[PDB]
Design a protein around this ligand. Sequence first.
Ligand SMILES: O=C1N[C@H](C(=O)O)c2c1c1c3ccccc3[nH]c1c1[nH]c3ccccc3c21
Length: 514
Amino acid sequence: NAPIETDVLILGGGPVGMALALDLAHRQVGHLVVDAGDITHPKVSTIGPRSMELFRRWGVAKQIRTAGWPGDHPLDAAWVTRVGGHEVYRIPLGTADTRATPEHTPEPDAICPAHWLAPLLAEAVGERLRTRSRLDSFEQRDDHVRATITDLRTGATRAVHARYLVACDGASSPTRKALGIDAPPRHRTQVFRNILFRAPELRSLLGERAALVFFLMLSSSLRFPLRSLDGRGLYNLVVGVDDAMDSFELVRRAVAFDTEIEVLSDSEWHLTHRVADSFSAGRVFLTGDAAHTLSPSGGFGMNTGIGSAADLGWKLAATLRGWAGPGLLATYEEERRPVAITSLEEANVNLRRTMDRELPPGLHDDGPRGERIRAAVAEKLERSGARREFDAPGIHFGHTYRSSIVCGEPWRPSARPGARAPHAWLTPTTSTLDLFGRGFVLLSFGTTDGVEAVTRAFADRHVPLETVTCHAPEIHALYERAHVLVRPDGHVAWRGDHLPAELGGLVDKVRGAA
Ligand SMILES: O=C1N[C@H](C(=O)O)c2c1c1c3ccccc3[nH]c1c1[nH]c3ccccc3c21
């Protein structure tokens, strides 16, 4: 009959669309997610420690850890000639259960394939997720956007009113194409096949030699990962496709065992390096793949999209509540593009590592001449810095925003402006991270002078703000300055042992007004 009314219309029900939905939900912003219900892309099971911190904010981290990934399954990354052949190099990474509890984060990375993450994110989001719904089209108006969604379950079509429209329609984003925004390739496009197969006993056979992922060194086409998706029988084999040999043949090539193998799917997927020239066109925005696609080498892809959705999340709400400066939305691209590009390059440095590593003559050679050749590689491989692909704390946490709303100061955790406020335990159950996520938060160590001042400045502009006084010195040390200001996203916006005189000039700068 009449149009639907919501502030933010999310296009794309994948992890990123859901993340934006969860954060917006926690900021009390009315939204609606439409997913055609009907994405040829890498497989993607890992969730970085930074994304796990965001899900902690949203109360779903636990559900993700108990989703189904077995706790006694290895997390090792192993380089081999074949899965069951000679092992060349290995990075022990323990199991989910028994492993060193991280010191720089309260939430270590996690495993949760799509056939588990999807239902999770769906329930956490609830009714505001309209599955099996297709966007017919969208027209942009002066103060809002108008779309048309067809309920693919009933056939009915419905018009939707919305202050803003955010698209997460993947790397092929129609919305981006429609907005006439381009995303030229930052690096060469390669082709790969994702062979999903089931090996009921593959794990039993391997035993202690199992691994979250196996890097193959068997051929030009078979020198790519073989991952345990659910550590319960499901596996994915990546194989390189020259520019242009059978599914079951290949899998049987990768695995040295004579055990039951059932191929479930075998599909192509382009590996691309594309960052959109723009992240928005007026009232329509772009997140995740639609704005920045990278190589899955390092799992930076999804974390950068979830990291971007969260940034757009509090900037959308702020403009909606009316307290952000008219220039704050513009900062989404100003801060998130450079991160996407930095993560893109590093992902590429991991991809290159694998492509350039030429494979020796008698590598899969048995007995010593071979044991020695393989030993050789195990060293050059480590010399090439393989571990970087799995231990990259600088990509997960190390991203400092240099922008018009961070009073900048001209790996190891820093409370440096534009950076993510470091982790520290205030109590064995509450991390400092747990204070960030709502509105601005002012931290003070020892002193409390000048706080009544800021409290009012922010209050002058309705800018939500919380002030916390902390005491232990370890944290005070870690954060350095006496007064640290954290944005709704948990990144430092300013710090110093003394609050500057005209606070209005400050509040206005951080909210993106002046
Ligand atoms: O397809 C993938 N799927 C994996 C993914 O989902 O990113 C993946 C994939 C590939 C991958 C695929 C082709 C060539 C090199 C590659 N490195 C990787 C990866 N390196 C990682 C490090 C940590 C976590 C995941 C990966 C990874």
